Amino acid sequence: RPTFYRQELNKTIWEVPERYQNLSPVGSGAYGSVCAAFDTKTGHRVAVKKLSRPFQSIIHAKRTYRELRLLKHMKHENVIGLLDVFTPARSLEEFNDVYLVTHLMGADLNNIVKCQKLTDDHVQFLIYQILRGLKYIHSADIIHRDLKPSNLAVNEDCELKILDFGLYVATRWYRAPEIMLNWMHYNQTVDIWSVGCIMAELLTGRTLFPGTDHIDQLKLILRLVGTPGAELLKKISSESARNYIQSLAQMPKMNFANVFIGANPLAVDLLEKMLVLDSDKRITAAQALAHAYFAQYHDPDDEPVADPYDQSFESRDLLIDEWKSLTYDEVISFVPPPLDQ
Numbered sequence: 043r044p045t046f047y048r049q050e051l052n053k054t055i056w057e058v059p060e061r062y063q064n065l066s067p068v069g070s071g072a073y074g075s076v077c078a079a080f081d082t083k084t085g086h087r088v089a090v091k092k093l094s095r096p097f098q099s100i101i102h103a104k105r106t107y108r109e110l111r112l113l114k115h116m117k118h119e120n121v122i123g124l125l126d127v128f129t130p131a132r133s134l135e136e137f138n139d140v141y142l143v144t145h146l147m148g149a150d151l152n153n154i155v156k157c158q159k160l161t162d163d164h165v166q167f168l169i170y171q172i173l174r175g176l177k178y179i180h181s182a183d184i185i186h187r188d189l190k191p192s193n194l195a196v197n198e199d200c201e202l203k204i205l206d207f208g209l210y211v212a213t214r215w216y217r218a219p220e221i222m223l224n225w226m227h228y229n230q231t232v233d234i235w236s237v238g239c240i241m242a243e244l245l246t247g248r249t250l251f252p253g254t255d256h257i258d259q260l261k262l263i264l265r266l267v268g269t270p271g272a273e274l275l276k277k278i279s280s281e282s283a284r285n286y287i288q289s290l291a292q293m294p295k296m297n298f299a300n301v302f303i304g305a306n307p308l309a310v311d312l313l314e315k316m317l318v319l320d321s322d323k324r325i326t327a328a329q330a331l332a333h334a335y336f337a338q339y340h341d342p343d344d345e346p347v348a349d350p351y352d353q354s355f356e357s358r359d360l361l362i363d364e365w366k367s368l369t370y371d372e373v374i375s376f377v378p379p380p381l382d383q
């Protein structure tokens with residue numbers, strides 16, 4: 043067990059191993075209780091997040107467990123990873139605080155597109171990295187579900203990582219129509235819809251579908267992609283949804299080349315494949331990596347899949363102390379990753 047030191051920062055107690063020095067609040071509470079710190083073991087900067095009320099209820103307890111399991115699984119260049127996890131507690135009995143250490147990421151894509159629309163080369167590279175990380179996540183039957191520019195981090199070198207900071211930039215604007223309506227017939231390609239919305243925004247400088255609510259959101263979508271045809275209508279099991287759709291004045295699919303005017307035609311074509319209303323016809327991440335738009339980056343020998351991930355816990359209903367105990371086990375069993383420089 044290492045030696046811990048205590049301090050207070052912006053209303054909160056912080057008790058961290060001496061390994062981590064020079065703690066400094068980041069994001070002004072936007073990411074929660076997160077400090078930048080210097081990791082004396084590698085001489086790199088890191089971020090340290092102290093979870094807020096991790097075991098307050100059964101649902102927080104399960105959320106905490108879920109986040110820790112997900113972080114311990116992720117081992118890919120384009121997905122956030124876990125450098126360390128610790129608690130000052132010596133026993134399960136004392137266990138009440140969980141700290142997570144990750145790389146300190148440079149800036150998000152909200153705070154880069156809001157600087158300027160990007161070049162087509164920069165778009166190719168950022169979307170390629172998003173898709174490569176999604177191939178990995180999706181291969182373990184993990185769906186992000188909340189992809190948006192503030193959940194993508196990019197250092198000065200344009201290397202990108204997918205994360206999810208949790209609770210400016212609304213989720214609904216990037217959400218797939220099937221899980222903002224019925225939430226029934228959906229798959230991993232909800233994340234691909236989000237990637238199309240992100241990619242559009244990077245190319246144009248403008249949010250593709252800035253809806254005010256779920257109804258307005260949907261209306262903005264249908265204006266580009268057109269109202270569902272008979273074939274998609276056949277697959278809607280929700281009757282109120284089917285009624286709503288069929289109650290609208292029927293709208294034609296736009297020609298995307300007339301919407302994204304002057305864009306690389308290979309970008310336009312890929313957007314056509316991502317922003318399809320029918321989730322069975324939308325391009326997967328693995329398929330999109332092989333699209334000609336990424337010809338400069340695509341390497342089918344360097345686009346790895348994930349180890350399988352046991353999600354069976356998601357179906358369990360357990361007590362707070364059980365979720366707490368499981369989370370303790372995961373802290374104890376953590377194997378730090380290989381150091382890199």
Ligand SMILES: Nc1c(C(=O)NCc2ccc(C(=O)N[C@@H](CCC3CCCCC3)C(=O)NC3CCCCC3)cc2)cnn1-c1ccccc1
Binds near residue numbers: 110
């Ligand atoms: N602010 C920060 C941090 C920081 O906060 N690090 C800690 C951390 C911990 C967990 C996750 C995190 O992603 N959890 C996830 C893990 C699983 C997820 C990963 C991505 C693929 C899908 C699965 C998570 O479980 N979500 C939850 C959080 C609570 C409930 C909502 C979602 C993200 C960061 C680091 N750099 N910067 C920074 C970024 C830009 C500029 C300046 C500084």
